[PDB]
Symmetry: D2
């Protein structure tokens, strides 16, 4: 329990003010909001935190604030991944300094790197993490890095690796990974297939939509555990109706907008080049916020 | 049942040493599947090596399977070809032979517009003369990538009664189920059967059902009973087998296991498919024994 | 002589009932010859062979041979997914007196590279002496071959050429660099000029049916070191290709040919649909332009 | 005039992965000496994506001090972030670059409209310097249609397009639609064919060690000497074959190191070192190039 990384953890968003600068008050409220809905932990500084349109110092600032707000209360995973190994190492040392429970890193992107280079990249970050377990992060759709099962097996067995965030819709691979690593902490990465992901082998998940309805994902975990398939499907379907909308509106901004209507986020903007939410979607987003507040 | 829902084996086509149809083995395979308690057979699809068969050879298999199983279990005739006319001929034959439904893969190789795909299905449905159509979506092999909206349009065409979804995208699987509560939805990838059912599929069609269809039936039952553990254990056992078959070559691997099961006389596939690597025989034979002892 | 040159990928004319239109097929073969084409690639994608039966494909090979054997080079595309069916057509090509055979990498089902190699060997054997033209067209076949695999295929006993339907001109140059004597056909009409510069020494294409002389002109222009003419000719070809892609290439070509009094009924076989009527004016005008220019 | 053959500049680092200023200056001078028309700075080749904003600005400033007025200078200021890209654009303006450039923002999916506004914002910050749109789908993962490219190149303030695409049909279509557009061929290995299809120049990594060869191809084609153009392209490709095997940036730095231009041939991690089995060929290539011209 004190070291268990298994569970449902929200990929934290980064609230910005009207000038696109970090909105500290809103970030703090969002952390507390997540804690209150029973989330098992937070995954900070990942794609959802818009880490790739932030500087290193901005990412460290977010990590420090989240730790001050949640260290101890819930599990905290710091995504310290950058294309550069040196930058990733800096964030890793900061994560340990702030007291995070683990670090994570997306496979470095843009430039093509050999598998050996990817491996050494993880080794170097693990070294700088000084004891904090590493969560390998596989997300081919965004990184453009396509790993084979054998390569995934090598990565998750590297000394210091304690988990894999599997953002892949391939549930054959999900099952194969579980079969080869019975003890590996395996996070389902695509919210829209959470239930099927757990059935295939995942033992938890990390996702953007958990910020506004994490309790539903927890409900799916419970349902499957109790053999209540109908309830598991019902909850997954409700999550997917929401995901359908967010994909149309733009996921991060759609989520921030809902959080704004829930009195959590002051200004629902994402950083440029991300544009604002199209006015035509506001009625549905407001209705959703209203519904989630009633439900919860 | 008065519907097409269920676990249907994608029938293999046994050939002799000369690569000609082995009628005796074909009949044995049909009975073997029926004896296993399968709900039906999907005939003339990818698994039956239809794409390396002539139109007359595909029709011959449809006739024989009909003679062997008509009225005992459901029979779906995959009549799809790149050509609409050839597909129509097979549809007319499926009708004459008494099949319960027809099916057709999205025409491939040549790029066709969505409207052309729709007209293709409409034409085949016309020739099916009343038999419901099972749209067949298999992007990995066809090269045809349909959007959810296009799939929705296809499954709502007059005469369509089901969709064989050979896609590993379980978000789309759920979306399809959500938009079509009554649609017969077959999971196409054996290796994700359990997850596919959980996502919304209400049955499945697969190649490996030929040697262990009861396991898939067991997964259906396990989920219906809310026994997640048993569903996972069974899926895992199926995947261990699928891992092997992918290494050996799926069709020939299955035919080889069937050979050791005293069903298929000669486990060959048609060229360009090559033979099974001898180094795999020990494992395939052990699997055959394991499956037999399991029954 | 050899197989180098500009060969038109022959279309298969059909009547209103989608049956082979022999009269029009013969007219198209004679038409191409009159354009000064070096040869014909028969039974390939452009001939709508993948929506024809073995018997129908054989009939087309037999008829084209009767019409052009000895006048121009004839390459029979005998490729099918099935090796056996491919061999049957190979044997027929030999019987009818074609100059060479060709086969697209078998598609739909995934085959190991070894199975692809054995497939070509089997067909080469049935071709009974006729040289094999390997056909690489990943866009349509879904088969992605590495450079090493292509090198292996082109060096198989009996292989005398490669139809490279790929827009990767780096690979085109690499292939030429590794095989200085290989007959290498550029496959995408829209990059013909650049394809030749990269290493191709000829080409096979669908649009050669209505303007083969333009491609022959590009070959001449580059050979004379006249780059601007080569570019001008390529640009004109691409303006037409832009249109044919909008209308649908095969039916667009057949429609133009119809307006040229060559093809009676410009229909393709289903699932191919008819040409959108809104394109007729442009296609008819193009037909007018091409006849005058020639 | 931005038309021409311009080297995508590499960024030399020392043993501790820090900027090697002296080698950066030497490489700039080396390029000027081999007759390059200009330099493309801070792009993929400069390892900009494993550098911080301040580090990228430092390189822009040093290169400007070394070559402003001597050769054309294009600053690639592109980042995923619009704000960051704008900061670099303003710097490029301050340092006196002739133009700015920006790769289509990557990793996160962006709508075409967002891509357009991204460019507009950077163009605004460039305060006068023309924008060179940078299309490189293989690395960015952003696939643009011909129509979208036409829209981008017609944006106010856009004066060129670096086309890192092997699609020469599209290359011809772009030229046909834009007779006066400065169009740079981006893949060195198809340079000759790219020019024939419509490109009127190029920007490439290998220009750092054999830019004169590309200049020769331009000359050969302009003179109608197809044979020489092909010969030069073949020699370039033999080299590119090797570089792809060794790793392009590190292979180039190693050659430059053997030419005594670059002190330490390392790229920043995660890039690894060159496999020693390739040193004999790289040394031989450096020897050949030095004795060649
Ligand atoms: O929407 C994004 C993606 O479709 C993802 O859900 C799939 O790739 C699942 O296989
Ligand atoms: O092996 C075949 C395939 O990987 C299949 O399992 C996946 O496509 C599902 O995403
Ligand atoms: O238009 C069709 C294709 O894009 C073709 O020109 C390209 O594949 C060649 O690079
Ligand atoms: O090698 C790099 C790439 O393969 C490049 O040559 C191709 O994309 C060109 O079409």
């Amino acid at each position: 329990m004190a070291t268990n990384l298994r569970g449902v953890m929200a990929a934290l968003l980064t609230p910005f003010d009207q000038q696109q600068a970090l909105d500290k008050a809103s970030l703090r409220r969002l952390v507390q909001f997540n804690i209150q809905q029973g989330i098992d932990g937070l995954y900070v500084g990942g794609s959802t935190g818009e880490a790739f349109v932030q500087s290193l110092s901005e990412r460290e600032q977010v990590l420090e604030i989240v730790a001050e707000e949640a260290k101890g209360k819930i599990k905290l995973i710091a995504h310290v991944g950058c294309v550069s190994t040196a930058e990733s190492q800096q964030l890793a040392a900061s994560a340990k300094r702030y007291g995070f429970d683990a670090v994570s890193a997306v496979t470095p992107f843009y430039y093509p790197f050999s598998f050996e280079e990817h491996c050494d990249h993880y080794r170097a970050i693990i070294d700088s993490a000084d004891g904090l377990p590493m969560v390998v992060y596989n997300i081919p759709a965004l990184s453009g890095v396509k790993l084979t099962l054998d390569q995934i097996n090598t990565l998750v067995t590297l000394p210091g690796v304690g988990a894999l965030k599997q953002t892949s819709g391939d549930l054959y691979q999900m099952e194969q990974i579980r079969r080869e690593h019975p003890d590996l902490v395996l996070y389902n990465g695509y919210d829209e297939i959470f239930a099927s992901g757990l059935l295939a082998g995942a033992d938890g998940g990390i996702g953007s939509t958990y910020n506004i309805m994490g309790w539903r994902y927890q409900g799916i975990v419970k349902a499957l555990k109790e053999g209540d398939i109908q309830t598991a499907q019902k909850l997954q379907t409700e999550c997917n109706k929401v995901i359908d909308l967010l994909i149309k509106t733009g996921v991060f901004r759609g989520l921030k907008t809902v959080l704004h209507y829930m009195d959590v986020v002051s200004v629902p903007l994402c950083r440029k080049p991300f544009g604002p939410v199209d006015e035509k979607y506001l009625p549905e987003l407001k209705a959703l916020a209203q519904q989630l507040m009633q439900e919860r």
